[PDB]
Amino acid sequence: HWGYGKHNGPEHWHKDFPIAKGERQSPVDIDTHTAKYDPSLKPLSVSYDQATSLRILNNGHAFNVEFDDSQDKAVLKGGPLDGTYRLIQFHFHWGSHDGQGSEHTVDKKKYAAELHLVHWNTKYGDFGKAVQQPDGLAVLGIFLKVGSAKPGLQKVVDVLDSIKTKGKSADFTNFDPRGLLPESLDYWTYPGSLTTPPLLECVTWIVLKEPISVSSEQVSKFRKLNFNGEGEPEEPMVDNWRPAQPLKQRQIKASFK
Numbered sequence: 001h002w003g004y005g006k007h008n009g010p011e012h013w014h015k016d017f018p019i020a021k022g023e024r025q026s027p028v029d030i031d032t033h034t035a036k037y038d039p040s041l042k043p044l045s046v047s048y049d050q051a052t053s054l055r056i057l058n059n060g061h062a063f064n065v066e067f068d069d070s071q072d073k074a075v076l077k078g079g080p081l082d083g084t085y086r087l088i089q090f091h092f093h094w095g096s097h098d099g100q101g102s103e104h105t106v107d108k109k110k111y112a113a114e115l116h117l118v119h120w121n122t123k124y125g126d127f128g129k130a131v132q133q134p135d136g137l138a139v140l141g142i143f144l145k146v147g148s149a150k151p152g153l154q155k156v157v158d159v160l161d162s163i164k165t166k167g168k169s170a171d172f173t174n175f176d177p178r179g180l181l182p183e184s185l186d187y188w189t190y191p192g193s194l195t196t197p198p199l200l201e202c203v204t205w206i207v208l209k210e211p212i213s214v215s216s217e218q219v220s221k222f223r224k225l226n227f228n229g230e231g232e233p234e235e236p237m238v239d240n241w242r243p244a245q246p247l248k249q250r251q252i253k254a255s256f257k
């Protein structure tokens with residue numbers, strides 16, 4: 001089974017998932033000098049007022065906050081997207097220390113972590129059908145940098161102690177993901193893939209320019225989670241990120257100059 005270790009980590013995924021060497025893999029390094037301004041890209045429309053969070057789960061790879069995606073007003077649209085995409089879950093990737101942990105990089109700079117807000121294209125009926133199409137999902141990626149604390153993240157970080165091992169979960173209602181967004185919605189966009197197996201090339205990536213600031217203590221709580229199930233010897237959940245992949249024949253566009 002895949003993981004992030006020496007023997008089952010990202011360098012090994014291609015054996016079970018040959019698309020790992022595909023033409024539209026994620027993440028990627030974003031070169032700010034070559035990314036091209038496209039002043040025809042509409043503002044991003046992020047509507048989370050009626051986002052209805054359900055639970056938080058340690059899935060053995062990261063933790064996912066799951067949403068009720070029948071909420072037809074809880075949607076991402078605009079920007080580079082046609083039609084409407086529904087929020088299903090968000091999760092993070094992070095490092096064994098503050099100097100690494102993001103999946104996308106910006107001019108080769110890695111951030112302490114990266115948040116992914118996963119949405120599926122309503123035109124395909126559900127998430128399971130959408131992942132089989134090239135315009136099936138839209139993932140909103142947001143970098144975390146160490147600085148002042150992020151108040152809207154605190155409810156997430158405080159609940160992690162009770163879901164420390166694989167399989168554990170907690171009810172997690174009335175979490176408002178708007179508390180995780182930076183001031184600015186300027187972004188870079190490119191077509192790419194899920195960054196975990198099955199690595200399907202079904203994602204329009206929308207990566208915000210502006211990181212959110214989280215405190216050193218908040219991010220260190222991510223690192224207290226464990227990959228293993230209860231009753232195995234603790235295996236700290238850190239460095240669950242996939243490194244930058246070849247950009248091949250893709251152009252990264254920017255919503256801003």
Ligand SMILES: [Cl-]
Pocket residue numbers: 157217218221
């Ligand atoms: Cl804290």
Ligand SMILES: [Zn+2]
Pocket residue numbers: 091092093116195
């Ligand atoms: Zn992710």
